Write a protein that binds this ligand. Structure first.
Ligand SMILES: CCCCOc1ccc([C@@H](C)NCCCNCCC(c2ccccc2)c2ccccc2)cc1OCCCC
Ligand SMILES: CCCCOc1ccc([C@@H](C)NCCCNCCC(c2ccccc2)c2ccccc2)cc1OCCCC
Ligand SMILES: [Ca+2]
Ligand SMILES: [Ca+2]
Ligand SMILES: [Ca+2]
Ligand SMILES: [Ca+2]
Length: 144
């Protein structure tokens, strides 16, 4: 079910959160990412987001806890308003299509730097109709 690739892409994203590179994600680290993505949770909410995934109650999120949750099956009945919120961070022009630019812009804001190709390969794996962009329906499928 899970491939060494998905696992490796999950270790990368983990690194987006764990900025001090100590192998654990904190509420402070979660908050800064949330904000980079135009979200503004409170300490309490940050604390709630981390507790829900904190399988070992240690207070922070290690990779194993991250993989678990990240790989967890996102039902289609789930709160769609969340996926929607997620789509809006990318589609910054609100036109209904995520372009590599929009993807790039987000990465940059996440402290991430990618080659033009890294991003392109990213869009393509998301693209279903081949128009070179990612729409909502397409976004939904890969997110769930
Ligand atoms: C930039 C590489 C990091 C990959 O991270 C992730 C990898 C896989 C996932 C899982 C749960 N979703 C399904 C697989 C899609 N992964 C790559 C798709 C890509 C992407 C998103 C939108 C349009 C085209 C491509 C992407 C980039 C950055 C953040 C999330 C997604 C989430 C990630 O989100 C973490 C980022 C939170 C701010
Ligand atoms: C603007 C709101 C961002 C929510 O993003 C996402 C929301 C849900 C998912 C799905 C596929 N993951 C499983 C459902 C639980 N997600 C909440 C976990 C949370 C989280 C991460 C680390 C530690 C504790 C909690 C999170 C926040 C931001 C980005 C990814 C994950 C992926 C996202 O990543 C792709 C879009 C952002 C790059
Ligand atoms: Ca950390
Ligand atoms: Ca933990
Ligand atoms: Ca757009
Ligand atoms: Ca498309």
């Amino acid at each position: 079910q899970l491939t060494e690739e998905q696992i490796a892409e999950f270790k990368e994203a983990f690194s987006l959160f764990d900025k001090d590179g100590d192998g654990t994600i904190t509420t402070k680290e979660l908050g800064t990412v949330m904000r980079s993505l135009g979200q503004n949770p409170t300490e309490a909410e940050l604390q709630d987001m981390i507790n829900e995934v904190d399988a070992d109650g240690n207070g922070t999120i290690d990779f194993p806890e991250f993989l678990t949750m990240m790989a967890r099956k996102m039902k289609d009945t789930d709160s769609e308003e969340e996926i929607r919120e997620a789509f809006r961070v990318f589609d910054k022009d609100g036109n209904g299509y995520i372009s590599a630019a929009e993807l790039r812009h987000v990465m940059t804001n996440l402290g991430e730097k990618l080659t033009d190709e890294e991003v392109d390969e990213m869009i393509r794996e998301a693209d279903i109709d081949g128009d070179g962009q990612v729409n909502y329906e397409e976004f939904v499928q890969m997110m769930t």
